[PDB]
Ligand SMILES: CC(C)CCC[C@@H](C)[C@H]1CC[C@H]2[C@@H]3CC=C4C[C@@H](O)CC[C@]4(C)[C@H]3CC[C@]12C
Ligand SMILES: CC(C)CCC[C@@H](C)[C@H]1CC[C@H]2[C@@H]3CC=C4C[C@@H](O)CC[C@]4(C)[C@H]3CC[C@]12C
Ligand SMILES: CC(C)CCC[C@@H](C)[C@H]1CC[C@H]2[C@@H]3CC=C4C[C@@H](O)CC[C@]4(C)[C@H]3CC[C@]12C
Ligand SMILES: CC(C)CCC[C@@H](C)[C@H]1CC[C@H]2[C@@H]3CC=C4C[C@@H](O)CC[C@]4(C)[C@H]3CC[C@]12C
């Protein structure tokens with residue numbers, strides 16, 4: 095009944111407190127800090143005429159995809175700034191995009207409730223809408239790929255989905271979130287994935303079998319971004335309460351909080367470095383902050399965006415960090 | 428309804444010490460710090476971005 | 478320097494840049510209207526008159542291309558996608574007059590209007606207000622007085638004075654009177670002058686923006 | 695005593711003018727939001743002001759300070775011709791900005807299609823064409839550089855073409871903009887006050903800076919009266935300081951320009 099839920103929640107909190115023998119900050123106290131981190135805008139990708147809401151790097155760490163209110167995705171070659179592709183969108187309201195791990199496909203989604211998949215390597219050359227995935231009843235916040243055949247998707251329906259592009263229909267529906275899911279993060283082995291929602295909670299789900307493995311709370315506002323640690327055993331969540339947090343899958347509770355008195359603005363994007371030592375959180379104070387993931391000390395500041403830093407990404411090889419903002423420019427550091 | 432069984436399944440998971448998890452996190456970070464271009468600035472000769 | 482493949486890549490990038498510039502120039506002349514209302518405000522009738530998820534209605538009037546975005550099917554949180562419409566030319570709000578005594582979508586409409594026109598994204602965005610179903614209101618007021626929704630109302634139970642009071646209260650819900658203006662119109666069950674009023678409000682907003690570029694506003 | 699103060703005030707004026715023009719040019723070029731045809735016209739006006747501040751004012755200062763003028767009987771003609779061209783091109787930019795604003799507020803719907811970079815480039819090209827056509831005629835015909843009012847027919851042609859015609863055009867095009875703004879205001883106090891004050895600041899500056907010089911030119915060129923060198927120099931530099939005033943009028947009243955200045 096409704097009375098036993100509180101008792102079991104108290105039991106879980108007591109178990110978590112018992113497991114909290116020490117703290118991450120007090121263990122990484124003696125390790126040498128990285129110090130000031132300096133980054134310069136190596137590239138400035140121009141060509142968008144409206145606010146940019148999402149991006150995704152390619153597996154080869156060279157090509158990337160960017161989505162803006164222009165109603166057109168752009169596949170950029172980050173090394174030489176050349177626009178490889180410009181895919182017009184049927185619906186101009188897009189707030190998520192994803193670049194397939196094999197590079198063949200590119201997905202996007204927004205207020206049309208559809209994560210449309212375009213085929214980039216078609217025979218005729220010109221990109222075409224390979225699949226239109228419908229079935230969500232809310233604005234589409236993030237749909238990330240798994241392979242050329244499967245995809246996971248998060249919408250404002252407070253539910254996530256696992257679509258088979260070839261068939262075109264959901265194969266698993268993840269329910270349990272109270273608010274709108276606004277973030278996804280696939281595990282490096284692609285076995286589990288975490289989703290942060292507007293109910294100030296991030297749920298770790300199992301892809302293959304479906305049920306919610308774990309739930310992590312601690313935020314005081316809506317969660318706008320989330321990302322696994324490169325090890326795959328931890329993840330960082332950015333919320334509207336101006337604080338990032340690092341939760342651990344095995345420890346089943348948060349380990350460190352990244353916040354400051356100067357920052358009072360929500361986080362729009364969170365990403366990790368290749369080694370996981372740096373945590374790059376894009377703030378809607380028109381900039382980004384690089385935190386020491388083991389110290390919570392602000393190791394650097396990335397400034398140069400006139401408007402809110404909507405999307406942030408770190409390459410697979412960790413060579414560069416690309417930030418896309420509402421001033422319609424991408425910047426590669 | 429389904430919430431009680433879902434939360435029971437959540438509560439019946441295995442647990443680990445926070446110290447061990449933090450130690451593993453530090454071990455991974457210090458093992459892969461050498462392969463992190465962002466942490467240690469790579470020379471511009473090997474940097475594909477100029 | 479650049480090889481044949483590199484030169485072809487640069488040529489493709491330049492052609493794509495040309496296409497993007499042409500598309501942006503084409504789309505910068507379009508007037509963006511964000512249609513909002515209550516559950517039974519009557520926005521569907523208005524859309525039918527002039528012409529899944531968000532519904533885009535494209536129409537043309539006097540060489541102006543209007544795109545109207547209806548987000549009535551979005552039952553999610555409003556603050557998580559409202560900023561997407563930060564750059565819309567105008568917000569077409571619809572209020573059903575006849576729903577003033579129905580148990581209380583009139584109060585819900587007032588609250589949602591207050592939340593919309595005072596939103597931080599729409600500080601400088603004008604609202605075109607429509608008071609739909611006034612023909613049914615004129616006959617509903619006779620049997621049911623307006624005092625049910627607004628106890629403070631004073632005067633005769635005349636549809637003209639009641640409509641004036643409702644309008645005045647909607648412009649009283651505004652707190653940015655020095656920046657934005659609310660254009661109020663009654664549908665009157667015809668489309669010609671309805672689209673004419675929308676066009677007039679849009680032209681007024683455009684002239685205001687042109688005067689503000691020079692600082693004269 | 696007087697000479698040092700005069701030199702200091704002239705040099706600070708001619709350096710403030712060039713810094714202001716450079717600031718306007720850099721603000722327009724750097725900011726991606728400020729890439730509009732009207733901002734292109736303002737940038738052209740700024741570069742014309744820069745030209746008249748770095749090619750005309752320095753030569754005027756050495757004439758004023760070092761009593762006489764010693765740079766040859768050839769470079770005097772070049773300086774006078776470039777001075778005509780620059781100080782007429784500034785006025786004609788002030789006129790075409792008025793044309794652009796009149797078309798933008800009056801025919802707002804139609805002029806949006808026509809507001810292309812090609813239109814602004816054509817406007818600036820015809821401004822420079824007019825400026826050249828009011829500077830070249832006197833070429834087909836020391837120790838001092840005295841203006842030669844030798845041919846009366848050119849005196850009326852130069853003074854009407856450069857100032858009085860743009861004067862009437864600016865007056866008409868801003869009176870019409872004032873009525874256009876009034877029609878908007880009346881159909882729905884402080885807004886009318888601001889609209890009157892900004893137009894007054896734009897018009898009265900252009901009057902008080904240039905009109906005395908051209909009225910004395912009209913007097914002298916018709917052999918009516920005679921004016922001393924000091925008064926002529928004072929009115930000449932009163933005309934020059936419009937190069938200083940113009941960026942203040944045409945950038946400080948725009949929100950985008952103020953934001954770009956704050957960013958810089
Ligand atoms: C000092 C030397 C270099 C002379 C400077 C004067 C001329 C050449 C300068 C002054 C203002 C400049 C313009 C300022 C802004 C822009 C818009 C930009 O999108 C392309 C370049 C362009 C169009 C510049 C071209 C060069 C320009 C016209
Ligand atoms: C004769 C010279 C010295 C006059 C002063 C420079 C003129 C030619 C320059 C200054 C600012 C310039 C314009 C600024 C911006 C643009 C928009 C761009 O998309 C095409 C070029 C264009 C239209 C420029 C070329 C012409 C322009 C008006
Ligand atoms: C191409 C331009 C920018 C070069 C510099 C121009 C200006 C700053 C220079 C050129 C010649 C200079 C003048 C040369 C000689 C004198 C006489 C001296 O008793 C006082 C200073 C004064 C009056 C100088 C003032 C500054 C001056 C006017
Ligand atoms: C060299 C001198 C003497 C003459 C130069 C030509 C003058 C008279 C011409 C050149 C361009 C002309 C303008 C071109 C377009 C317009 C717009 C419209 O409102 C009609 C008048 C007006 C404003 C014209 C007025 C006269 C004008 C300014």
Ligand SMILES: CC(C)CCC[C@@H](C)[C@H]1CC[C@H]2[C@@H]3CC=C4C[C@@H](O)CC[C@]4(C)[C@H]3CC[C@]12C
Nearest residue numbers: 696700703704707924925927928929931932935
């Ligand atoms: C700075 C503003 C007013 C623009 C005018 C600048 C020049 C032309 C002005 C500024 C200072 C002025 C001088 C100030 C004082 C005197 C002394 C007086 O017995 C004769 C005129 C004379 C010598 C003035 C001549 C004109 C002058 C040199």
Ligand SMILES: CN1CCN2c3ccccc3Cc3ccccc3[C@H]2C1
Nearest residue numbers: 774777778781782841852853856930
């Ligand atoms: C102050 N300086 C600029 C203003 N002026 C103008 C401008 C337009 C038409 C005629 C004249 C009068 C003249 C005649 C001979 C040389 C130089 C001019 C210049 C002198």
